[PDB]
Write an enzyme that holds these catalytic residues in place. Sequence first.
Site, mmCIF file in Angstrom:
data_model
loop_
_atom_site.group_PDB
_atom_site.id
_atom_site.type_symbol
_atom_site.label_atom_id
_atom_site.label_comp_id
_atom_site.label_asym_id
_atom_site.label_seq_id
_atom_site.Cartn_x
_atom_site.Cartn_y
_atom_site.Cartn_z
ATOM 1 N N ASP A 52 7.003 14.287 14.906
ATOM 2 C CA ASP A 52 6.585 13.978 13.520
ATOM 3 C C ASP A 52 6.018 12.560 13.443
ATOM 4 O OD1 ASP A 52 7.494 16.447 12.399
ATOM 5 O OD2 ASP A 52 9.483 15.760 12.733
ATOM 6 N N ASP B 88 -7.669 6.227 14.386
ATOM 7 C CA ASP B 88 -7.306 6.393 12.951
ATOM 8 C C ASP B 88 -8.152 5.734 11.858
ATOM 9 O OD1 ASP B 88 -6.448 3.249 13.414
ATOM 10 O OD2 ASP B 88 -4.726 4.217 12.700
ATOM 11 N N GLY C 11 -6.814 -8.242 15.950
ATOM 12 C CA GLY C 11 -6.465 -9.351 16.817
ATOM 13 C C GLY C 11 -5.172 -10.038 16.312
ATOM 14 N N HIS D 8 10.199 -2.160 8.909
ATOM 15 C CA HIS D 8 9.205 -2.097 7.815
ATOM 16 C C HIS D 8 8.267 -0.863 8.017
ATOM 17 C CE1 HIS D 8 6.271 -3.817 4.904
ATOM 18 N NE2 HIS D 8 5.489 -3.108 5.678
ATOM 19 N N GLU D 9 7.616 -0.746 9.167
ATOM 20 C CA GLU D 9 6.723 0.377 9.414
ATOM 21 C C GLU D 9 7.402 1.729 9.308
ATOM 22 O OE1 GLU D 9 3.813 -0.632 9.044
ATOM 23 O OE2 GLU D 9 4.161 -2.670 9.546
ATOM 24 N N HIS E 186 7.719 3.081 5.876
ATOM 25 C CA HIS E 186 6.512 3.812 5.433
ATOM 26 C C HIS E 186 6.522 5.217 6.023
ATOM 27 C CE1 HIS E 186 4.489 0.543 3.599
ATOM 28 N NE2 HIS E 186 4.329 -0.045 4.740
ATOM 29 N N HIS F 52 5.317 -0.396 -0.667
ATOM 30 C CA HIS F 52 5.661 -1.824 -0.649
ATOM 31 C C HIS F 52 6.409 -2.216 -1.881
ATOM 32 C CE1 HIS F 52 2.364 -2.911 2.259
ATOM 33 N NE2 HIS F 52 3.540 -2.769 2.827
HETATM 34 C C1 LIG Z 1 5.396 -6.831 7.069
HETATM 35 C C2 LIG Z 1 4.652 -6.733 8.414
HETATM 36 C C3 LIG Z 1 5.624 -6.210 9.480
HETATM 37 C C4 LIG Z 1 3.452 -5.752 8.347
HETATM 38 C C5 LIG Z 1 2.398 -6.108 7.273
HETATM 39 C C6 LIG Z 1 1.319 -5.023 7.030
HETATM 40 C C7 LIG Z 1 1.973 -3.753 6.564
HETATM 41 O O1 LIG Z 1 2.468 -3.991 5.429
HETATM 42 N N1 LIG Z 1 2.018 -2.733 7.398
HETATM 43 O O2 LIG Z 1 2.756 -1.648 6.932
HETATM 44 C C8 LIG Z 1 1.601 -7.331 7.670
HETATM 45 O O3 LIG Z 1 1.056 -7.426 8.773
HETATM 46 N N2 LIG Z 1 1.530 -8.274 6.751
HETATM 47 C C9 LIG Z 1 0.743 -9.482 6.961
HETATM 48 C C10 LIG Z 1 0.085 -9.789 5.573
HETATM 49 C C11 LIG Z 1 -0.831 -10.956 5.637
HETATM 50 C C12 LIG Z 1 -0.506 -12.318 5.425
HETATM 51 N N3 LIG Z 1 -1.605 -13.118 5.596
HETATM 52 C C13 LIG Z 1 -2.656 -12.309 5.916
HETATM 53 C C14 LIG Z 1 -3.994 -12.597 6.189
HETATM 54 C C15 LIG Z 1 -4.872 -11.545 6.495
HETATM 55 C C16 LIG Z 1 -4.430 -10.211 6.534
HETATM 56 C C17 LIG Z 1 -3.091 -9.908 6.261
HETATM 57 C C18 LIG Z 1 -2.205 -10.949 5.952
HETATM 58 C C19 LIG Z 1 -1.600 -14.590 5.546
HETATM 59 C C20 LIG Z 1 -1.607 -15.243 6.952
HETATM 60 C C21 LIG Z 1 -0.458 -14.876 7.924
HETATM 61 C C22 LIG Z 1 -0.789 -13.714 8.886
HETATM 62 C C23 LIG Z 1 0.354 -13.311 9.841
HETATM 63 C C24 LIG Z 1 1.500 -12.526 9.159
HETATM 64 N N4 LIG Z 1 0.923 -11.313 8.544
HETATM 65 C C25 LIG Z 1 1.486 -10.682 7.526
HETATM 66 O O4 LIG Z 1 2.523 -11.083 6.996
HETATM 67 CA CA LIG Z 2 -3.286 -8.540 14.115
HETATM 68 CA CA LIG Z 3 2.695 12.466 12.625
HETATM 69 ZN ZN LIG Z 4 -3.560 2.799 13.591
HETATM 70 ZN ZN LIG Z 5 3.639 -2.230 5.001
#
Ligand SMILES: CC(C)C[C@H](CC(=O)NO)C(=O)N[C@H]1Cc2cn(c3ccccc23)CCCCCCNC1=O
Ligand SMILES: [Ca+2]
Ligand SMILES: [Ca+2]
Ligand SMILES: [Zn+2]
Ligand SMILES: [Zn+2]
Length: 166
Positions: free
Chosen positions: A59, A71, A77, A120-121, A124, A130
């Site tokens: 699943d 996807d 990056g 967290h993932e 979802h 969120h």
């Molecule tokens: C909760 C996590 C496990 C998954 C989440 C995404 C998510 O919610 N997946 O289900 C995530 O990656 N959030 C970003 C959100 C975010 C913060 N900024 C960003 C700048 C550009 C794009 C995204 C972000 C500001 C700069 C800091 C970037 C590094 C940290 N990134 C984050 O906190």
């Molecule tokens: Ca990244």
């Molecule tokens: Ca699946």
């Molecule tokens: Zn993906």
């Molecule tokens: Zn999320």
Amino acid sequence: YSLFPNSPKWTSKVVTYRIVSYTRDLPHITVDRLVSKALNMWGKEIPLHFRKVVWGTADIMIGFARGAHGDSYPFDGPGNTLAHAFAPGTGLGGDAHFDEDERWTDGSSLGINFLYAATHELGHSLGMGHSSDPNAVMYPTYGNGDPQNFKLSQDDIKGIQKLYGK
Ligand SMILES: CC(C)C[C@H](CC(=O)NO)C(=O)N[C@H]1Cc2cn(c3ccccc23)CCCCCCNC1=O
Ligand SMILES: [Ca+2]
Ligand SMILES: [Ca+2]
Ligand SMILES: [Zn+2]
Ligand SMILES: [Zn+2]
């Protein structure tokens, strides 16, 4: 908390999961243990049980990838988006992908804590949206609390239980 539109959720008593690919940053057994920990964090609160399979369809398909990977939600990056997942459903539904360009850690070094990101993932993958609460695991940004000392918040437990019962 918030749920996805139309409150998609798994209907089966057991949900399977499979780790399709691993990160070079951690031992494979660490990723396996951390995914089991993340799933049971939510599992403890609800009527659901999980089973790991090592071949075929599951699943919840879990994997690491960098840039474009099928996807239509390419990774960016290092930094910015860390990982993403999809609401319960067939195929891509319920799957969780982690950006391999991130430096993943179990918490003993600098980097992004895989247990926190996976909890967290997988929230979802189970149907959680969120939260607006900065203390909740389902909050959209990483790093508010303490990635090495956390637990589901009351907001997160309220949401998952609204979805699957206690
Ligand atoms: C909760 C996590 C496990 C998954 C989440 C995404 C998510 O919610 N997946 O289900 C995530 O990656 N959030 C970003 C959100 C975010 C913060 N900024 C960003 C700048 C550009 C794009 C995204 C972000 C500001 C700069 C800091 C970037 C590094 C940290 N990134 C984050 O906190
Ligand atoms: Ca990244
Ligand atoms: Ca699946
Ligand atoms: Zn993906
Ligand atoms: Zn999320």
